[PDB]
Amino acid sequence: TRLKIVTIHQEPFVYVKPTMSDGTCKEEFTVNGDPVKKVICTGPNHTVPQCCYGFCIDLLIKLARTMNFTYEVHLVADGKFGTQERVNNSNKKEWNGMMGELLSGQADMIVAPLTINTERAQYIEFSKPFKYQGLTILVKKGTRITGINDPRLRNPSDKFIYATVKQSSVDIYFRRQVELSTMYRHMEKHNYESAAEAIQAVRDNKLHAFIWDSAVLEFEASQKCDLVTTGELFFRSGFGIGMRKDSPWKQNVSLSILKSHENGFMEDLDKTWVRYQECDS
């Protein structure tokens, strides 16, 4: 009867840490002094039980309590958010990432910073947005870039490397645009397997610009004094809970999210996981 929840590593929404030697999760406290809520999430490190926590885990716990359901959390096996591609060298198309697991039954609900878009909505159902954000660019402090329209992005060269995450909605955003064709062709040869790796690459001067979700990039840039964002969101998008079409949970999930937007719960999550301290990482 327990719902199979699938999520993905993506700070500050989902932190993933090893369990202690005894199998439990380290006791930690939030900026307010409250215990950090931790859930066991099984997934690749070899697949093993790990500790998960963060904005989305707090949201999951709230949803489960409000809707009275039990659950078990696991990390997406291929580590991706999800795009639709031909498989097995054939013309058969299947979704990968969390999208694929939801559609196959490996998961019953996606609880993560999952972008709501038209393409995905054709195959699954989304709750109303639990977070409003957009797309921006992360660069090393000192790198001068105007934004998505900067000549170094519009007129690609091996002197300034930029990229995004493979099999993500962001990669498709550029792929489905004839105007951004020159950009998509450039990133295609530099895209990273995960946001963490791309962010580290910018920090190590291996990647000059990382195009990604502002909710994630502004957090990263605000915690690391050596990283900054262009500041402007060149596109707006929301994060929502994902469920299969005609699921018995959609109505109640959106109802819970509405209440959380009305009573300060979502705002408190931001004060707990997003805006609470100066850079030092």
UniProtKB/Swiss-Prot annotation:
Post-translational modifications: NMDA is probably regulated by C-terminal phosphorylation of an isoform of NR1 by PKC. Its phosphorylated state is influenced by the formation of the NMDAR-PPP2CB complex and the NMDAR channel activity.
Domain of life: Eukaryota
Disulfide bonds: 25-51, 41-52, 225-279
Sequence ranges on the Extracellular membrane side: 144-281
Compartmental location: Cell membrane; Postsynaptic cell membrane; Synaptic cell membrane; Postsynaptic density membrane
Annotated positions binding glycine: 113, 115, 120, 169, 213
Domain notes: A hydrophobic region that gives rise to the prediction of a transmembrane span does not cross the membrane, but is part of a discontinuously helical region that dips into the membrane and is probably part of the pore and of the selectivity filter. The extracellular N-terminal domain (ATD) is a site of allosteric regulation to modulate overall receptor function.
UniProt record similarity statement: Belongs to the glutamate-gated ion channel (TC 1.A.10.1) family. NR1/GRIN1 subfamily.
Subunit annotation: Heterotetramer; the NMDAR subunits are modular and harbor tiered domains that function in concert to regulate opening and closing of the cation-selective ion channel pore. Forms heterotetrameric channels composed of two GluN1/zeta subunits (GRIN1), and two identical GluN2/epsilon subunits (GRIN2A, GRIN2B, GRIN2C or GRIN2D) or GluN3 subunits (GRIN3A or GRIN3B) (in vitro). Can also form heterotetrameric channels that contain at least two GluN1 subunits and at least two different GluN2 subunits (or a combination of one GluN2 and one GluN3 subunits) (in vitro).
Known role: Component of N-methyl-D-aspartate (NMDA) receptors (NMDARs) that function as heterotetrameric, ligand-gated cation channels with high calcium permeability and voltage-dependent block by Mg(2+). NMDARs participate in synaptic plasticity for learning and memory formation by contributing to the long-term potentiation (LTP). Channel activation requires binding of the neurotransmitter L-glutamate to the GluN2 subunit, glycine or D-serine binding to the GluN1 subunit, plus membrane depolarization to eliminate channel inhibition by Mg(2+).
Protein name in the entry: Glutamate receptor ionotropic, NMDA 1
Residue window of the full protein shown: 396 to 800 of 938
